[PDB]
Design a binder for this molecule. Structure first.
Ligand SMILES: CCC(CC)CN(C[C@@H](O)[C@H](Cc1ccccc1)NC(=O)O[C@H]1CO[C@H]2OCC[C@H]21)S(=O)(=O)c1ccc(N)cc1
Lengths: 99, 99
């Protein structure tokens, strides 16, 4: 689809068999989701945003469906202000900026 | 033009007679630029993201040229690690997300 930016580009995602709302964030290198239980192994990592660095749990090769488009990649889980879909997955669903 | 997301969507902008590189950020509600000495009045503001909040100065009706597309609106200025073009100006240049 073509999404305008007058409102936040929020979409429904499916991860770990659970539906969630997430923000399409072209300014994020990585995908960061709020606290949740994800199956499989994970390692602790650090990620930095506009206000500093937080601690997250890194999940690799996680299946995640974004607005009907499947992707398999890295998902970081931690105290982010909002679920964000970053470029590591936006590239997988073929997402581009156009003007 | 069309911009893929393999790398950060950095583009050249023109503000207050200065050329800078800035991130086209669909996750940012409002444009925030690295510290710079703009003239005119402003109102304090705090914006939040990963890591917490930073204090910024809100300037209104600031003219910015993004990839030759002229825009005018709110521009925040503060200790951001990177220049960020937010939705408040992305809409004005006709920018959409597509997949
Ligand atoms: C609340 C929704 C997001 C945070 C989740 C808002 N951010 C824009 C976001 O694109 C930010 C913009 C940003 C980019 C780079 C450095 C600081 C901020 N990128 C970001 O935090 O991504 C992190 C996760 O992937 C990594 O790659 C980038 C940093 C990591 S922000 O920087 O904090 C921001 C908040 C309010 C305004 N008006 C302008 C910008």
């Amino acid at each position: 689809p073509q999404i305008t930016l007058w409102k936040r580009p929020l979409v429904t995602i499916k991860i770990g068999g659970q539906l969630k709302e997430a923000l399409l964030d072209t300014g994020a290198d990585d995908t960061v989701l709020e606290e949740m239980n994800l199956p499989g192994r994970w390692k602790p990592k650090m990620i930095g945003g506009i206000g500093g660095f937080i601690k997250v749990r890194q999940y690799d090769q996680i299946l995640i469906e974004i607005c009907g488009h499947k992707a398999i990649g890295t998902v970081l889980v931690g105290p982010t202000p909002i679920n964000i879909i970053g470029r590591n997955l936006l590239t997988q669903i073929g997402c581009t900026l156009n003007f």
